Scaffold this active site. Structure first.
Site, PDB file in Angstrom:
ATOM      1  N   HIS A   1      59.171  55.826  59.496  1.00  0.00           N
ATOM      2  CA  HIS A   1      59.409  56.836  60.532  1.00  0.00           C
ATOM      3  C   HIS A   1      58.631  56.492  61.804  1.00  0.00           C
ATOM      4  CE1 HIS A   1      55.418  58.680  60.213  1.00  0.00           C
ATOM      5  NE2 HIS A   1      55.544  58.647  58.896  1.00  0.00           N
TER       6      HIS A   1
ATOM      7  N   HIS B   1      57.035  55.899  54.716  1.00  0.00           N
ATOM      8  CA  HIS B   1      55.821  55.846  55.514  1.00  0.00           C
ATOM      9  C   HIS B   1      55.225  54.444  55.462  1.00  0.00           C
ATOM     10  CE1 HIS B   1      55.895  60.272  55.667  1.00  0.00           C
ATOM     11  NE2 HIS B   1      56.323  60.174  54.422  1.00  0.00           N
TER      12      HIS B   1
END
Lengths: 228, 230, 230, 230
Positions: D11, D184
């Protein structure tokens, strides 16, 4: 091309007693247990491997499924049990002697109940001691999908969604499927798969204890149908 | 929230609503207005303390995006999400993509009303080899082709919505899960018909406004105790 | 039952136990004694009113058949059943299929004791191209090859049992489901180690009898209130 | 395409990144810049013909929203989505919510380098009853309490990421599914270490850029044929 295998369970203790069974959870007889073992051995000898097995929630079908898998060296195969593959519910006829019933209501009314596609049997009271509504294995389902009596047409209407949601997607993903179930639920699947008319389906024979093989094309159309 | 509660949300205006085109299973996006409706609905669920354990939606983008916005705006985008063709809008047949005004001009108001909502009459069917047939959309590639419709009315829509209630939504509620269903006018009207026990006659008048959360309070047997819009 | 209970059942004697062979992941059948042990356990659970909502087992036939017998003899063969390699017996490496007595004659008593009961000593590893390597068994064909072991000790068995506790068994208990786990000595010993909080230094002394239902009463945090054998 | 491809996306910028705040399991939102990065990555995937059959993400909003934007901008928001804590960012313990400069003041400049450059050194742990503890978050309520960490390093992150590779991601690839993983920095780094066979000594230097699709071409055994950023 994929192969799809059906197996109908063999004799139950109530078949031996000439009783209407439906959704009552009766045990296989010794003969029915042997039939399951013979079927599994036949699948083994012809090299049938499965990736997934579908069965009903009735013990006679599940035990047939487990026996067939074990006798073909694949008891590890994942197993999904569903009420949608249950035998046709026989209403208030469940538990009754077929001979005593024909002698009470006449040979003709009994022939209708057993051989009419869309004639419902006498319905079972919803809080009868032997109503399926009292059976813990349906406790997680809304009560109105638990039937009080079925014919083959209504049986098909609740089998078909399981073909659409689970069985056909498995085939289309490349999985080798075993379906271990009952006379009328397998007859319902066969009617759909083979496009059999309402007029013809009640006469379709599905023998107990004999693996039935369909070979289907990429659109799930039947290319071959043969008993093993 | 003393009782078991079930929440429905119909998506807001799409780009084809604004252009006055029949949509059906065509995968059109929300308009800015429809996006605002989803956000306002999420904020209302937040303000009133509605927490969900599972979210069900269709496989049409306008509904999934509505579902995601509602979840995010009520601080619960982590909620597990199941997308199913069984909650799709009704298939509009050959009418998909046509102008609604020109169709009413060619065929008359009454014929258009019948195609819009009927319990016995299908829309004109979409040819199976049409460039915009659902048979060509890969999101249905794991379905038998006979399951993918060429056109539907409300009765036919109900017949493929109901098994999803029987297999997924109702078991979730009975297991104690707080359910959100984010879908379409006709698929929500189909669920309401079954949940509320509405007759074939009376369901023709059931209206479900866009973007307004609909709450059912259900008892242990899934009977409606109370129904209200937030 | 007044509390949330978790039931373990270790399978009974196998045809290789009778013949004094290391088994591991080899897929051997139960003996007549092992089959009777499973029926007696199901009868015990039936007599004491143990109902299950879900059953977990390994992918080894002796455990699945034990699970199926126990469910049938307690009138609940309908219970959903999940089979996982993560509940398999410890893989015994090259020792699989060897006679334990003749192995002790070749290597000495102490070395066999170390292989049997050291927490973190691997057995001699099984060549990946051996006909009886687990890499050749199609029941692991959907797993990456490097998770299929060539040999294990209890420490690495715990490392692959524990995710299945975290992902499947504990969430089931926490959702209110009454769970049966039908598995093997080392995989149940691994679960016990975690659930009971037993040290590395003490776990190799924990005995799990074959064919005897083991019951944990747990609190809402999955802490053992009571442990008893049926 | 030519072979079996696996796509990762980290992200983009969160609202805490410009404030220079350690984030970890705190459920912070994407910045406007982070939202744009997700849209551009989805646009790039669409332009290069990347279709997905399943998408895996964490249960943190910034990754889920990235996943949804990437699917929507590539016209495939219908793709099934599975959210798991096992793909969460590394938990940063007591450093979560603190400034990186204010961290140097309370712990010293050298000690901070270790906590950000050591594979196996835990950060100071967050007290389990802290106001900003993850144990209070309802998205983990269905899990045993001990899987919710009080702080992690990369080694411990890998230990809880890897079972999800073994149980869900790799079996999907092996079944022929085209997989997207939206997560992540540290959880994708953990996956990369395992997939690529990177040593403990080299993995802390592995950079995974934000908003940049990472593509693996894998062979039938899931060995890397090629790795490239799109």
């Amino acid at each position: 091309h994929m192969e799809l295998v059906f197996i109908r369970h063999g004799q139950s203790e109530w078949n031996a007693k000439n009783l209407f069974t439906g959704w009552r959870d009766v045990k296989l007889s010794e003969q029915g247990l042997a039939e399951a073992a013979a079927a599994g051995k036949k699948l083994k000898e012809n090299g049938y491997e499965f990736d997934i097995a579908f069965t009903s929630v009735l013990t006679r079908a599940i035990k047939t499924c487990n026996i067939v898998l074990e006798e073909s060296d694949q008891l590890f195969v994942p197993q999904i049990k569903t009420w949608r593959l249950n035998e046709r519910h026989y209403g208030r006829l469940q538990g009754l002697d077929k001979k005593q019933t024909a002698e009470k209501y006449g040979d003709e009314q009994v022939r209708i109940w057993r051989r009419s596609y869309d004639t419902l049997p006498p319905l079972l009271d919803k809080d009868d001691a032997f109503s399926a509504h009292k059976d813990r294995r349906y406790a997680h389902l809304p009560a109105d999908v638990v039937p009080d009596g079925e014919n083959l047409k209504v049986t098909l209407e609740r089998v078909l969604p399981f073909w659409e949601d689970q069985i056909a997607p498995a085939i289309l993903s490349g999985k080798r499927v075993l379906v271990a179930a009952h006379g009328n639920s397998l007859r319902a699947l066969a009617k759909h798969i083979e496009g059999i008319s309402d007029e013809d389906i009640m006469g379709l024979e599905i023998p107990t204890g004999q693996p039935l093989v369909y070979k289907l094309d990429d659109n799930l159309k039947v290319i071959e149908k043969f008993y093993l």
